Symmetry: D2
Subunit: 510 residues, 4 copies
């Protein structure tokens, strides 16, 4: 809108209402607070696009029923194919974690840790359910190999910290620095160590194969360190799960250093700030986020900002001021998807969290300085002569001039719609598809609003197109994206077949 970024900031207006559409994808983690079919229905209406299953906790039976509930709540809306919203299922792997043992005692399963006190760490399975003030167990077998005297051991997602004083053959005497209440099977981080667990562990092969059987849409592979880790996960999914999108989670120092080879192998990225903020200094996480989002935008691949975006909303019904700014800034940085972990999995206000996510994202979109964003994306794009790319850039450029309410894209594999999203247009991308997996996986991309055409293929191609285009027109009028008499962009082929979406059309809305 304005000639400089500084004037663009100065022009930002609280009283200027945002567009009804919301481009940024929302990913909610399912758990105790959101597992029920009636709650899942409300989360879908509130704005959920992808349900994340965290395989660091549940059994296969538990997760199987969580999937069952999600599809019940999803297909609840299928009676009306206009207002039907696809909902993806995502399997977040355990990965090479270090979790502690269980706690001994009555009342509750917790014990205090004084600042300055001693705590012996052990690998002996006799203390596997007898962790307390003095002794502590953890499942990583080679912990004495990778650790030295003075090394930090962070327990329970950063809260508690320990410095190693002495070593044994298989035991470590440590001194407590940050106190607090220890619990059962809390996560442990070893910043400075080189943890040598397998990227695809024995448990993870079972969880992935289960993912293929359950027909999940994507896999959030944890603690990805290098490009070979992504190919290991690709192999385990194999032929049958070839179409399952692999999103590499960057959770550690090694993963940041090797980001380019990891991005090359992966379908997308998750900036998993949780583990990253322990493994790397807290100041710096933003550097890593902005870098990874930046490179993913340039590469044209989905990137997900994740964890602790609305942490206070576990306990409270409204977010903090910092949590408000974090979500907005992640969207302004250019993140395709925002994520909620504990907020929806085990929180007292799951629905309010999903709505805040929707609300902030929706006018972070408005505050994007599109003039500069689009200018720079063209320059930094390679000079390939793929007809689908050139149509996409034409569509996006066309959309900025005739302030379009939408860009409608007929697509089988999603790729035609992905390439439009790559250039970050202001208008939403109504991706029309008969492939239901394509509709679900499209949530990963910023601004793609998938719609599933359940209708049978009409005889003539020319009339089959017009049905899918008019189907999208009806969805756009229904959602408020545009009205009768407005202008929109339409992307179709020349005789059908996945591979050549080469036709842009500026159509008046009927």
């Amino acid at each position: 809108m304005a000639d400089t970024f500084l004037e663009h900031m100065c022009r930002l207006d609280i009283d200027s209402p945002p567009i009804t559409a919301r481009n940024t994808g929302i990913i909610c983690t399912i758990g105790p607070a959101s597992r029920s079919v009636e709650t899942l229905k409300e989360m879908i209406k509130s704005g959920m696009n992808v349900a994340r299953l965290n395989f660091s906790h549940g059994t296969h039976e538990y997760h199987a029923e969580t999937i069952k509930n999600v599809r019940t709540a999803t297909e609840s809306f299928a009676s009306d194919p206009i207002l039907y919203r696809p909902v993806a299922v995502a399997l977040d792997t355990k990965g090479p974690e270090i979790r502690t043992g269980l706690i001994k005692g009555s009342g509750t399963a917790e014990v205090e840790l004084k600042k300055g006190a001693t705590l012996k760490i052990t690998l002996d399975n006799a203390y596997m359910e007898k962790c307390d003030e003095n002794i502590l167990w953890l499942d990583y077998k080679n912990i004495c190999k990778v650790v030295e005297v003075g090394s930090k051991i962070y327990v329970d997602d950063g809260l508690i910290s320990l410095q190693v004083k002495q070593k044994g053959a298989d035991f470590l005497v440590t001194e407590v620095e940050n106190g607090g209440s220890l619990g059962s099977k809390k996560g442990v981080n070893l910043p400075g160590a080189a943890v040598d667990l397998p990227a695809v562990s024995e448990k993870d092969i079972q969880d992935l194969k289960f993912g293929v059987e359950q027909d999940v849409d994507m896999v959030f592979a944890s603690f990805i360190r290098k490009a070979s880790d992504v190919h290991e996960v690709r192999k385990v999914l194999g032929e049958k799960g070839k179409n399952i999108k692999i999103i590499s989670k960057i959770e550690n120092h090694e993963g940041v250093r090797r980001f380019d080879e990891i991005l090359e192998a992966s379908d997308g990225i998750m900036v998993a700030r949780g583990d990253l903020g322990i493994e790397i200094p807290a100041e710096k996480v933003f550097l890593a986020q902005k870098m990874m989002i930046g490179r993913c935008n340039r590469a044209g691949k989905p990137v997900i900002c994740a964890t602790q975006m609305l942490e206070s909303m576990i306990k409270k019904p409204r977010p903090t001021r910092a949590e408000g700014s974090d979500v907005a800034n992640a969207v302004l940085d250019g993140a395709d998807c925002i994520m909620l972990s504990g907020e929806t999995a085990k929180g007292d206000y799951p629905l309010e969290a999903v709505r805040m996510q929707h609300l902030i994202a929706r006018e972070a979109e408005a505050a994007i300085y599109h003039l500069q964003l689009f200018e720079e994306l063209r320059r930094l794009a390679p000079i390939t002569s793929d007809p689908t790319e050139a149509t996409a850039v034409g569509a996006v450029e066309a959309s900025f001039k005739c302030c379009s309410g939408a860009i409608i894209v007929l697509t089988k594999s999603g790729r035609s719609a992905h390439q439009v999203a790559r250039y970050r247009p202001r208008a939403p991308i109504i991706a029309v598809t008969r492939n239901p997996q394509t509709a679900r996986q499209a949530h990963l991309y910023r601004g793609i609003f998938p719609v599933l055409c359940k209708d049978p293929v009409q005889e003539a191609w020319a009339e089959d197109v017009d049905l899918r285009v008019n189907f999208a027109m009806n969805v756009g009028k229904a959602r408020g994206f545009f009205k009768k008499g407005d202008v929109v962009i339409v992307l179709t082929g020349w005789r059908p077949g996945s591979g050549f979406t080469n036709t842009m059309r500026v159509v008046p809305v009927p």
Copy 2:
């Protein structure tokens, strides 16, 4: 290509050969040296696109035969509809000129004028063919009304200059400043004065009506001062000449000050540097040129740089260094058409002049900094939601990415093709049309390479399009614009009818 204009300059390369296509239109004035049918044939092959007829000199009989010869030489190539080049006819009006009388004496019709001597100017028709050292006649009746003591009177296109010492009721005693040889019926300019002749004079109404009868494509209306002058010319052309394009010539101070209202009324503009450089100081003409070309580019209307671009080539076979740089710079400024006046009308080297025009223009196109040109044209464009505009910008944006050999545009009125030219793409715009006037008038716009489809309308619309598109493909292969296997942009409608070219298509060349 490069990140800054300065590096763009530094990168310019004499050894890098230019593209075979030449986007800038060439307008040649026809006269004694170029009137013959065999010479007109060679000028068309050398690169002529518009033939200009100067109605300050010829009779209606004379100009009628000049038109006849142009169409003979043009239709000479019509046997091959691939290599047929349309050629426009343009009628340049007399307008409110001030010409002197004839000269007395034997030997030749010329007399000397010393610096510092006296010259009496008279309106008495007894001296109408007796102009000499002492007395001089001129056809402007109210010359004593608009002139005062100290006013400059420039005779013979700037060469000779006079300062007014005394006044009479109908005579002026002047003193000579610049000497030289006076001649018969030379043009007179009155810088500082406000000449009150009619914009559409009595003679001009005859010449315009003749223009309509002869079926000319455009009118270069001389000495346009204000917007009402353009509407007077529009009226005289009337219903029958409604489709004749009016190009307002800016020849004077008043015309520059009122440029915006004149541009609004006119179809295009000519920066007539000849009279402008006398009426306004010589330094400043470039300011006026760059301004008018700039505003015309922003308005999306044709602009023509004109007169004295290769003056030395009247006498010599090669241009001066300044004349080389002038043509290049006019193209770099963003002029749609370059013009030759005396160079082709009465010169010893008409063909070499037209070829230089072609040669310079053709790699001025290459030196355009398109990165900046296209960026700035988008910003300065209004945010209209006309479907034809948004398709045009999409086409042009698409053309920069898949380095297209051309942008093919099916168009009846030319408007679909005009709107593509407005955003100055690098590739040539092959405008396919059945209307032969549309083909001729399209030369006014930068980069539009019109082709006339003489074939009858095929039955199905879908196959009628494919014939016109494949016709353009054959022209492009013939001219070297592109080859088999290359990519091009194609613009068509959705069911035929002039008003909605709304379909962009990235097609491989068959």
Copy 3:
């Protein structure tokens, strides 16, 4: 560093260590957890620059001793004038707050509020200490004037919310939306309403006059609605407190709408997100922040991002991921000062909070895209011919070319140094001053590192300058800003006197 903002993001590097200097000012609120002289000493070393006193709670006796402790801990370091860091005192006024009455009952002073229940609000002072489930008192007299049916009333800093169902003459029947435990004299916010309390209330006149007596450096005036509110505060401070800087806190909708007139009157701004996030929707606070920071940067006036930047660090020793990104982004937005409210006032980890503030800020500075920031600031600056401005821009431009370790500025009033900070140079601005208040107030400006020259004025001006310049050279070597042999910029006058710093000098470091 890079040609585009997108490549600049992509280039950001966690492994690239930051510059030793930290440009962004840090403001800590003093209270129970940080009031002691030994804790204040550690906060100064950790990075405190301004001590904020919140006059909504303490008595004048209480705050007087807090000031006494701050100056004791500050002057503790005065023995070494090289490593002495000035520390400002700031008085944050009560302003037009709306607090409830006291609670009835034994044990503790609290009652529950169910979601959906009824609560009658009253102005009758008989219920002034009898607030409960049914009745609630509050000190705002005209609450029925500014409120209508459907208006929200937020109690206890956002936690509890009420919708107005009915109205009375002086009573309001409301329905509860967000439940929770009500308490004694909790703050109330009225989103939508136009609260007509006095901007400078009766209590505030006492607090301001006390501020003048105590010799505070700045006043954070709360709930500033319009420009006249700033002039009221200016008057109360009067002649004796003329040099006390007024920082208008934007806490409400009215204040955002009138931002430009408020900024014109005020010396600086605080984006008080606390009250702003209740008064305005939570999504939107970032819009208001970015706007106010943007306009303050363009105006060349201090702006302070404030409240809830590290809220979790009240309870925990490390911040959340969102809190890390919030501080970085506020610095990237261009905030001069970051602020801690509860984190230092009543938290379990005051020192760790001040260190995080220092750590994040310090490499947010590094991630600033200075190429674009400086380009845009020049364009958006007026074309004034003040000699001090032109020297400042020259200094800043010079600093980018000879990668200067610092820009040294001799200044009495601080204004010469303020104008250098206005153009946001990468290097720190070592402002040398004999006025001790100038040194303290300079913390408000980004990158000004004040140093107090306690030495007496040496006889010759030329040698007096060289003493102050060499004093700064010694501070710069001490702090690691630069070393012997490096280059720095130096700003001095031409014969001394506050008003003309007109001399830039590129000096090698001795």
Copy 4:
């Protein structure tokens, strides 16, 4: 001034009068029409800055007296040291030219050449003064070595052209293409050939040594092909002529290809369009000009646009429209100096040509888009930490903000002033110097207006500076550059000595 280059063009105004100062240097070639002391006086007042002596024609006696007259006419104004303008002398070498023999016959020394006829070229000195229709002599001995069948031979600066049909051992039979009148000792060009004459020929060593003896300021070395040619010329000038600036003339294809190594060795460049436009195609000369001017601006070295800029003004009192635009565009391209060859050397209107040069240049300066020019020059500058560079950029940046009437620079060698000119400020650079050669050589740089301080060195350095600064203030008021009360930039040292101009000062004009 404006946000885009396109709006900048649109904003250009004929009625907006230009600044009184004229930044672009003017170089006039002296000959028959301008050799007299009274004419040289008028040319100096009209705007001459450098007198060029063409050593392809005169004897050493002839040129010695031309120099004598120039210094007489120059020192004529020395009585008033305020209005004294230094005037450089420049020696343009013969270089490896190919000139023909003399013509046989009475009446005049000319013969006709028909198109299509035969002309035998010979190296036999018996035909050295017997060139005619059939036989032609030329001084290049190895002409048969470097030429083949089909090679073009251009005679008399492009007018006449010949194609080689046959070869001999030492004779060539050719066919005429372009006719015209041949003359005595006309220049010959061999485009496509690799002419192997010495860069510093035997005659050139005499002319250079003479140049050193006469105390010329610069040498325009002709036909520079590579970097070694520049070092040969450097050697011949040697110790005694070490301070004589070498300006390499780019006249040929080889010189353009090797431009970077030539620029590295040379002090400046001349885009000698005369020979370049024959050696290289006429279309393309502009490419070569814009490239060379661009790279010279980036390198910070003088560049001179030359030959045929006002060719018609040899015969006529006013230039053509193309010649007007050429001078403006060369200045807009960024040429430091404009040059007149035949226009002043042997023309009927020398003074009018020098005035047009002055007039056009002077409001080409105004039409420069400085916003973009300065932005891009900073980015493309290396990040060196020379204190003189950083002061220069500071000065130039400061000058844009406080719309300075001038930037005053005290300089001995000129280098402090050269580095200010490198960043192309809008204001003129008043370079104050006691070295009279420094004053003369400073004309090579755009916008440096040298003034010679003839006064003796005053005792105190601080008062010696103030004398030179106040001397410049008086010159600026005299010329209209600024008035009493205005602001200007001043550049001085810290204790005198050539090597450290490190002090910028924004001074009010007394």
